[PDB]
Design a binder for this molecule. Structure first.
Ligand SMILES: OC[C@H]1O[C@H](OC[C@H]2O[C@H](O[C@H]3[C@H](O)[C@@H](O)[C@@H](O[C@H]4[C@H](O)[C@@H](O)[C@@H](O[C@H]5[C@H](O)[C@@H](O)[C@@H](O)O[C@@H]5CO)O[C@@H]4CO)O[C@@H]3CO)[C@H](O)[C@@H](O)[C@@H]2O)[C@H](O)[C@@H](O)[C@@H]1O
Ligand SMILES: OC[C@H]1O[C@@H](O)[C@H](O)[C@@H](O)[C@@H]1O
Ligand SMILES: [Ca+2]
Length: 854
């Protein structure tokens, strides 16, 4: 033919001239037409570099075509000579005649080609297309139907939106109206097999499958084998990388244990017993301490029934501590500290009975909830403030407000009675307590550079624990708002024991806590036990008008008091109100001359063939340290990499009685993630290089840090994160449905969608996954064949080591939180059929394209 409008056709019907996603077309993608023109008269053939946006040629409707013409004429593509002025376009809409819309669009393409010529490139055009697309609901975030759009929405302090999800469903249809994404089909995706619902027949926990990100299908037997690979890797990190050969993790902090198929918890425990013989061997179990993060109390029962392969997280204790001691007003009664925990501590005088557990005053997420509350307070009328309208400047403002408020007596945001919360935590029996980095240090400064105001109080309590805390526990109300928590000492079982250990006489502790700042002054009697008659006690911590004293300076009691002939200690107390105490805090320990360490060895406790973890004096001797904050800043030098600062201070952590060091998730972070902390990772096996460190440092540094912690006598756990990955660079065409956090379809303001092609980011994993994914499966099968013959509960089948995961894609994923791309990107023709490019491996339908690009 002669030259003309037919040159709008695609240069060729394949991937060399039409971008596509598994054969489907996206309205925001570009294509190479055969030719282009600036006036409709002279037409120029296209080089391989001359690509154009599809939104110049096709649209999902007449409405959107009219908006496009309108928008471009109002943003630099006005030309009176081609019938395109602000006046000529002001009234056009979906009901404008078809032939004049097509004419206006053709003339606009000429006007656009003139702009491309003038600007010597498509750079401005590309920005104008992106700016236009953001104003069209079906081509942008709002059509995904966020809960944030609801009238008078209240943002959630968690900073995630639980019900903003989509599931990936099967679709092997031959109907072009439904499309086909069969490469992403699965025989698994068993969702919500969480905690006691592992077998699908007890949802008394109602714990959700979905949190945030791309949710991994931990019911897929190939995925379950890959988790064993990943565990084995981390447990031998340093020697498998050729880095420090003692730079190997000893165990795991298990992220999101309530939100993944519980099979993986059974399987992790099995692996670690195969490798280290933990079951029935407290010394081996305790050397490989592992503990599960969760806020559902039903996990205690689950873990007991399983023989306790990991520690239960006692969140009840945290909420009790905050409700009793931490509020400004409407404090719960002091007695709740006795009863409202997974362990009742009224008179706790036995061992191997309580649910093995870990407890805390603060963790990284709880500090975040406070900071996000503050952000929401500071910037009301911004409903999506916790989603896409979040700005780091709001966090900075909140942190400045927090540090100021933390120093006040009348705190508006920060917790009251932080020292007393710790005094209870670190004296409690039948728990492994967990101290938070950000309660010892100002967590937004460079790593460990600024001590927190609570550093002195908490570190005093930490050292005394190692020296003194052992034996039975009794907690007793002395009045309606004040309590004494007493430990009787190593080898002292209860208040009536004489003591059976050489350290019995000189160990034990009394912690006095009240939560009424107006409490009248009075005397109180504390029962130290029969092993502690006529004995001198030191005033470790007492309260003063302005704070705490560590040497009985200007407090109600002197530096030493002595018990009577029955073991009763007599003490004076009253209510105070200062930045450290709202109520009262007192701590008493026996006076001693030298060093003392009351740790009980695991070789000396009762072994039980059916238990891994047992709550006894040996396990109680452990203390966990959370080494990070979400708001930890990017380092300013190699010397300030957390890993190097940590290695340098190894002896400090040992001196504070820390036995188990919880290291942040060390994985390569998604660069655009909110915090760059490691839970939003793109590569599960790359833990940073010298050229490209993570927030915390390089892999080589990590291995040296672990070795240095081992040299100081500590064991080290890695935060293992099976639930989600975030930041995949590869898009895939998936078939999806709008759901809540359990994968059940919902409506949002009366609207919904189901079985729709969505161009989600799903594919990636980095070179770490390529190299290390499944690498160790052959050897694990050779050494521990039972791992791949034991039928898992949720599926009834063993993990499958015959397939290696070198690259993640949707077939291994349950779904995703909303990705802010739009549900209408997928090109449909007028009749509703999906457009499709039959090329290469994409054979699902015959090539079918819009008529505008022939
Ligand atoms: O073209 C731009 C960009 O596009 C792609 O990336 C899109 C990305 O979308 C999805 O991930 C986003 C997610 O859906 C959002 O909810 C949001 O996640 C936030 C949380 O909202 C936030 O609270 C926090 O989460 C942490 C918790 O607070 C904490 O308690 C603990 O549990 O750790 C959590 C994990 O960090 O931070 C996350 C992360 O910011 O933002 C997400 C994206 O930032 C989808 O899952 C991703 O796979 C998609 O990549 C391209 O990938 C990208 O290359 C391109 O530049
Ligand atoms: O942004 C669209 C881009 O698509 C690529 O496939 C082309 O090679 C680029 O020249 C073009 O600009
Ligand atoms: Ca999950």
């Amino acid at each position: 033919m002669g030259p003309g409008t037919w040159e709008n056709m695609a240069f060729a019907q394949d991937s060399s001239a039409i971008n596509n996603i598994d054969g489907y077309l996206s309205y925001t993608d570009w294509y190479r037409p055969y030719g282009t023109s600036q006036d409709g008269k002279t037409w120029y053939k296209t080089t391989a570099m001359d690509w154009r946006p599809l939104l110049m040629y096709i649209w999902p409707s007449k409405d959107v075509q009219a908006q496009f013409i309108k928008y471009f004429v109002n943003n630099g593509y006005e030309n009176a000579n081609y019938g395109l002025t602000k006046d000529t376009v002001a009234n056009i809409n979906k009901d404008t005649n078809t032939t004049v819309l097509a004419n206006m669009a053709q003339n606009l393409r000429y006007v656009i080609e003139q702009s491309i010529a003038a600007n010597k490139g498509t750079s401005k055009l590309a920005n104008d297309i992106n700016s236009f697309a953001a104003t069209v609901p079906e081509l942008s975030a709002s059509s995904e139907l966020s809960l944030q759009s609801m009238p008078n929405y209240r943002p959630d302090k968690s900073g995630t939106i639980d019900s903003d999800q989509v599931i990936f469903v099967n679709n092997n249809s031959k109907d072009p109206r439904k499309g086909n994404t069969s490469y992403a089909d699965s025989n698994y995706r068993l969702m919500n097999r969480t905690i006691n619902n592992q077998a699908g027949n007890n949802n008394s926990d109602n714990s959700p499958e979905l949190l945030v990100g791309n949710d991994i299908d931990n019911s897929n037997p190939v995925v379950q084998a890959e988790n064993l690979n990943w565990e084995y890797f981390l447990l031998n990190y340093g020697k498998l990388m050729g880095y420090n050969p003692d730079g190997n993790f000893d165990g795991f902090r298990v992220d999101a244990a309530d939100n993944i198929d519980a099979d993986v918890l059974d399987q992790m425990g099995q692996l670690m017993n195969d490798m280290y013989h933990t079951k029935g061997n407290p010394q081996n179990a305790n050397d490989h301490l592992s503990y599960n993060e969760g806020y559902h109390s039903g996990a205690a029962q689950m873990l007991n029934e399983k023989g306790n392969p990991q520690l239960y997280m006692d969140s009840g204790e945290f909420y009790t501590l905050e409700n009793v001691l931490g509020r400004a007003n409407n404090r719960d009664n002091i007695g709740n500290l006795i009863t409202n925990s997974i362990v009742n501590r009224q008179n706790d005088t036995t061992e191997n009975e309580a649910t093995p557990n870990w407890s805390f005053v603060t963790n990284h997420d709880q500090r975040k909830n406070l900071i996000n509350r503050l952000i929401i307070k500071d910037h009301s009328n911004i409903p999506d403030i916790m989603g896409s309208a979040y700005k780091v400047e709001y966090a900075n403002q909140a942190w400045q407000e927090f540090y100021a408020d933390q120093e006040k007596t009348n705190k508006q945001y920060a917790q009251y009675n932080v020292p007393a919360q710790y005094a209870i935590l670190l004296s409690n029996k039948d728990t492994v307590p967990q101290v938070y980095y950000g309660d010892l240090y100002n967590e937004t400064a460079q790593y460990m550079q600024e001590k927190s105001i609570y550093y002195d109080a908490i570190t005093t309590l930490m050292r005394a624990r190692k020296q003194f805390v052992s034996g039975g526990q009794t907690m007793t109300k002395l009045n309606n708002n004040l309590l004494a928590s007493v430990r009787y000492g190593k080898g002292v079982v209860d208040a009536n024991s004489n003591g059976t250990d050489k350290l019995s006489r000189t160990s034990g502790m009394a912690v006095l806590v009240g939560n009424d700042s107006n409490m009248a002054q009075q005397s109180v009697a504390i029962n130290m036990g029969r092993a502690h008659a006529n004995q001198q006690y030191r005033n470790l911590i007492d309260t003063t008008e302005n704070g705490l004293t560590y040497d009985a300076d200007n407090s109600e009691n002197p530096a030493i008091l002595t018990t009577d002939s029955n073991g009763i200690l007599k003490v004076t107390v009253k209510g105070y109100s200062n930045p450290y105490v709202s109520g009262y805090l007192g701590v008493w320990v026996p006076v001693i001359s030298g060093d003392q360490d009351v740790t009980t060895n695991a070789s000396d406790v009762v072994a039980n063939k059916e238990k891994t973890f047992e709550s006894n004096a040996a396990l109680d001797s452990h203390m966990i340290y959370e080494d990070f904050s979400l708001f930890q800043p990017e380092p300013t030098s190699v010397e300030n990499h957390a890993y190097n600062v940590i290695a340098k201070n190894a002896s400090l952590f040992s001196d504070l009685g820390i036995t188990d060091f919880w290291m942040a998730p060390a994985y390569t972070p998604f660069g655009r993630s909110r915090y760059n902390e490691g839970y939003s990772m793109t590569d599960r096996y790359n833990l940073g290089t010298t050229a490209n460190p993570t927030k915390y440092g390089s892999g080589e540094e990590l291995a040296n840090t672990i070795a240095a912690l081992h040299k100081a006598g500590l064991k080290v756990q890695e935060d293992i994160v099976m639930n989600q990955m975030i930041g995949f660079s590869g898009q895939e065409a998936v078939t999806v449905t709008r759901t809540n956090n359990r994968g059940m379809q919902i409506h949002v303001n009366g609207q919904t969608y189901a079985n729709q092609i969505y161009f989600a980011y799903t594919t990636g994993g980095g070179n770490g996954q390529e190299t290390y994914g499944g690498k160790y499966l052959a050897e694990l099968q050779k050494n521990y064949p039972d791992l791949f013959t034991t039928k898992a509960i949720s599926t009834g089948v063993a993990p499958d080591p015959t397939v290696r995961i070198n690259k993640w894609s949707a077939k291994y994923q349950n779904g995703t939180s909303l990705q802010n791309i739009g549900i209408g990107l997928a090109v449909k023709l007028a009749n509703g059929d999906y457009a499709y490019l039959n090329s290469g491996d994409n054979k699902a339908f015959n090539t079918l394209l819009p008529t505008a690009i022939s």
